[PDB]
Each structure stands twice: as structure tokens, then as C-alpha cells.
């Protein structure tokens, strides 16, 4: 009688597992039936040019995140002031704003007409900066939140003691706080990188040309059809499984 509930749960859960598996799986599967194209795609240096631009651009957003996001994540896990409610909301803004809008909004500020752009002698549009700013905005919250849980996990006493043993707030931070939440900062970073990499909407609208993996696929999809994009898709899928399972095996 209990196998019915034990299976009901097992069944329902094995469904979404296939749902999320089938597509990804299938597309890479079928890349056998046309291993010629797949191989060519794999060799296509146009792809690799994009892949790198992608990975590298997203890697910058992450660093920017860690570098500015961490401090905030600490402040959120520890101190509690009147504003918080707001500060916490601002951090989650990007999660509610659809990709496209994000891009548009970003454009309204980093384009040569933007409050910021009109000053930044660094050009954003159709430039890494743009891509960065795009990816950043969309992944910043993702990092911060993870970084927060990090600091949140560290026993405050540990920090108390550390000051007790005569250690400035600054000392404590780098010797107790940080080192202890590293496995969260790291995870958070990796996660924000996966976010940047996966972004399409926010990006396309700011800088189209220094082309990103997501775009190159969309273009070929529209330009040559489905069967002309599958290869690049599968390449990008596999390309990711590797990079991430790799990272996991280098942390767990």
C-alpha cells in the first residue's frame, strides 16, 4: 500500500527529471546521425571565437560581482539596520525584470546618451563592457545571495573570539569570515558565471556584434533553420557539461 505513495512520489519526480533531461539529451544524441556537421561545427573557429568571448565576458562580470558583491553580502548577513528591507529588494530587482527590459534599461544608461555612458570614455555598446554590464546586472543577485548564505553560515562567536584575541574587524574578515565562507563565495561565483554565460536577452540589446554563444545560435537558427543550429547547440551543451562537472569535481 505504501509503495503507491512511495512510487507516486518517485513517478512524479521521475517526470520532471525526464522533462529536463530529454531535450538536452536528445539534441546531443542526434548529433551522431550527422556527426559530419557536428564535427565541422566543432572545428568552426567562428564558434570558438564566440565561446571565448562569452566565457571571458562572463568571467569579468563575476569578478566584479565578487569584488563588490561580497562586501554587501557580508553586511546583509551580519548587520541589521532600518534600510535593509529596501537594500535587500534592490539586490533582487534583476530577478523580476525580464531580460529584454534589463538590456533596455541598461542601454538607457550606458549608451552614449546614458547618464553614465555620456561620460564613460569607455564605449559600452557592441562592446565587452556592454556585454559585461549585461551579464553583471543579471547575475549580481545570484552571487550576492550565495555569498550571503556563506557569511551567514559562520558562527558569529568565531568572529567575536577573533576580535577578543586582539584582531581588528578587518583582520577578522580575511582570517575568520572569508576563509570560512570560501566554499560559498566559490559556489556563488561559479553560479553567477553560469548565469552570464546563459544570458541572451539583456545582452543582445546592448552589444549584438561582439557576438555571444547564445546569439550565434539564434542567428543560425533564423538564418539556416533548426538542423543548422543543432550542432552548435549540442557543442554548447557538451561544452558546458564539461566545464561544470569539471568545476564540481574540483570542489567536491
Amino acid at each position: 500500500m505504501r509503495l503507491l505513495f512511495s512510487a507516486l512520489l518517485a513517478l512524479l519526480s521521475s517526470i520532471i527529471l525526464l522533462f529536463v533531461l530529454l531535450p538536452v539529451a536528445a539534441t546531443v544524441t542526434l548529433q551522431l546521425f550527422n556527426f559530419d556537421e557536428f564535427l565541422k561545427a566543432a572545428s568552426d573557429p567562428a564558434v570558438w571565437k564566440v565561446v571565448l568571448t562569452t566565457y571571458y565576458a562572463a568571467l569579468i562580470s563575476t569578478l566584479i560581482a565578487v569584488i563588490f558583491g561580497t562586501p554587501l553580502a557580508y553586511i546583509l548577513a551580519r548587520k541589521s539596520f532600518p534600510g535593509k528591507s529596501v537594500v535587500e529588494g534592490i539586490v533582487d530587482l534583476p530577478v523580476v525584470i525580464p531580460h529584454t527590459v534589463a538590456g533596455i534599461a541598461l542601454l538607457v544608461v550606458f549608451g552614449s546618451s546614458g547618464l553614465i555612458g555620456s561620460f564613460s570614455p569607455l564605449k559600452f555598446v557592441d562592446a565587452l563592457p556592454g556585454i559585461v554590464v549585461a551579464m553583471l546586472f543579471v547575475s549580481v543577485p545570484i552571487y550576492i545571495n550565495q555569498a550571503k548564505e556563506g557569511f551567514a553560515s559562520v558562527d558569529v562567536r568565531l568572529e567575536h573570539v577573533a576580535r577578543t584575541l586582539g584582531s581588528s574587524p578587518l583582520r577578522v574578515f580575511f582570517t575568520v569570515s572569508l576563509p570560512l565562507s570560501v566554499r560559498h563565495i566559490v559556489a556563488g561565483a561559479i553560479m553567477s558565471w553560469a548565469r552570464g554565460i546563459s544570458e541572451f536577452g539583456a545582452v543582445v540589446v546592448i552589444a549584438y556584434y561582439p557576438m555571444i554563444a547564445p546569439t550565434l545560435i539564434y542567428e543560425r537558427y533564423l538564418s539556416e533553420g533548426l538542423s543548422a543550429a543543432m550542432p552548435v547547440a549540442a557543442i554548447l551543451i557538451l561544452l558546458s557539461l564539461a566545464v561544470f562537472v569539471a568545476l564540481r569535481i574540483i570542489v567536491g
Partner: protein, 240 residues
């Protein structure tokens, strides 16, 4: 009075207003769970500024000072051993202000003075309850602490073990002539270590002195609390 503390602190529906004088010996304040013992210590510690009042240590006002510039050695319930650091590095933390070789000296010196110099490479988890307690103390002492705060440093420990440990505390205190403010809810500990005994109840330190005195002079509050002697006496009767 080596340590004087007159201060008020509000925290929710909790109010901590104390008047506490302390010797240069082994003080021990008794108090049920939730009497304010831990904040009291964080106060002395300088990990909590009081709303009103001050904390004098050696006649000198310490309140404006940071937990870092005060000399106090702090130890929180279930010790705060840095889990990402080896026994050695744990003990060494707090000496970043000392010459290198000198630091290593002091470290190993204390590591030996506490019989842990062999665990110098392990990390907190590999340590036994007792091993922690030692590392804890080790790291707290190498700083040549003006004072030494502890709370429930003996909770979650079998009676059998407790006794041996208490004797070790007595020793450590006589050995390093380091005054100690030990906080618990257990009479057995007060009775076994204290040179003086305070008694906290609801953030207020009702009375201090010596156990014997505290009993006789029954005021129906501290009297009630210290009435546990009967159970300790009934038990001694029922055994051996």
C-alpha cells in the same frame, strides 16, 4: 577590585543592569539558563557596548575600548575554535603582533604547558572534547590575558570527566595567576572552583560572596536557587 562593572543593557524584553566587583582570583557566577550570563561576558569582552555605565579593568575605564585593545581572553559556550585552522595556527592567532620565532616559541611553549604539542597539526574535528578544551585554553592564554572569561566551558560533560577538568582549571589559574570569570548554572562547579560566587537572575547580579555565606543569608531568591544543595546532599547519601 580588579574588575568593576556597573552597566545597563536592553535587548528585547531583556534588561541587564549589573553592579559587579571582582577579585584577581577565580570568580564564578551562578545563574539559570537565560539569566544574562553570556551577554554579561560579551559586555566585559567588549563585544557589546552597554546602553549606560562602564567597565573598569585595573581601575582604568575600558568601555570605549574594542574587544581587540582590551586584554581579556574570551571563550564562548562550546568553544570557538577556528575550524579552518590547525591547533597550532589556532593558538598562534592572537599573536600576529609578536615576532615570528618568538611567536612559534610561545605557541609550542603553551602547547607543551597543556599537553597538546603533538596535536599541533590536527584541526578541530580530529580533537576530542578534552583536546578542544585544551586548544581553547592554549589560544586564550598565550596572549597573557588580563582576565579570562569562560561560560559553560564544562557543560555537555559527564560528571566523571567534569571533576578532573575542574581540577585542571584550578591548576591553570594557580599556574598562570590569571583571574577567571567562569559562568555556569551548576552549583557543583561553583562549589568546586570559586573563591567568590556571584548569582545572576534576570540580568541582575543579585548577590556575590562565598557559597557558605550565600546559603545562610537566605533572601528567598538566591536562597531558592542555591537550595539545590539538598539534592546534592540526598544524592551523596544514596551513594557510597
Amino acid at each position: 577590585m580588579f574588575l568593576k562593572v556597573r552597566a545597563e543593557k536592553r535587548l528585547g524584553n531583556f534588561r541587564l543592569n549589573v553592579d559587579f566587583e571582582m577579585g584577581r582570583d577565580y570568580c564564578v557566577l551562578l545563574g539559570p539558563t537565560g539569566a544574562g550570563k553570556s551577554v554579561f561576558l560579551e559586555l566585559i569582552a567588549g563585544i557589546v557596548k552597554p546602553d549606560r555605565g562602564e567597565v573598569r579593568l585595573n581601575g582604568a575605564d575600558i568601555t570605549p575600548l574594542p574587544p581587540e585593545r582590551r586584554g581579556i581572553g574570551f571563550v564562548p559556550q562550546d568553544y570557538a575554535l577556528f575550524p579552518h585552522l590547525s591547533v597550532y595556527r589556532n593558538i598562534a592567532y592572537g599573536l600576529r603582533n609578536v615576532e615570528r620565532v618568538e611567536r612559534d616559541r610561545r605557541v609550542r611553549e603553551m602547547a607543551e604547558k597543556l599537553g597538546i604539542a603533538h596535536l599541533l597539526d590536527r584541526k578541530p574535528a580530529r580533537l576530542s572534547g578534552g583536546e578542544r578544551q585544551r586548544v581553547a585554553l592554549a589560544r586564550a592564554l598565550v596572549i597573557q590575558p588580563r582576565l579570562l572569561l569562560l561560560d559553560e566551558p564544562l557543560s555537555a560533560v559527564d560528571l566523571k570527566t567534569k571533576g578532573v577538568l575542574m581540577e585542571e582549571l584550578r591548576f591553570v589559574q594557580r599556574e598562570f595567576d590569571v583571574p577567571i570569570l567562569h559562568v555556569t548554572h551548576d552549583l557543583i562547579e561553583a562549589a568546586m572552583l570559586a573563591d567568590e560566587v556571584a548569582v545572576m537572575l534576570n540580568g541582575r547580579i543579585v548577590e556575590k560572596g562565598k557559597l557558605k555565606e550565600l546559603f545562610s543569608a537566605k533572601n528567598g531568591e538566591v536562597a531558592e536557587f542555591l537550595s539545590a544543595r539538598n539534592l546534592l546532599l540526598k544524592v551523596s547519601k544514596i551513594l557510597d
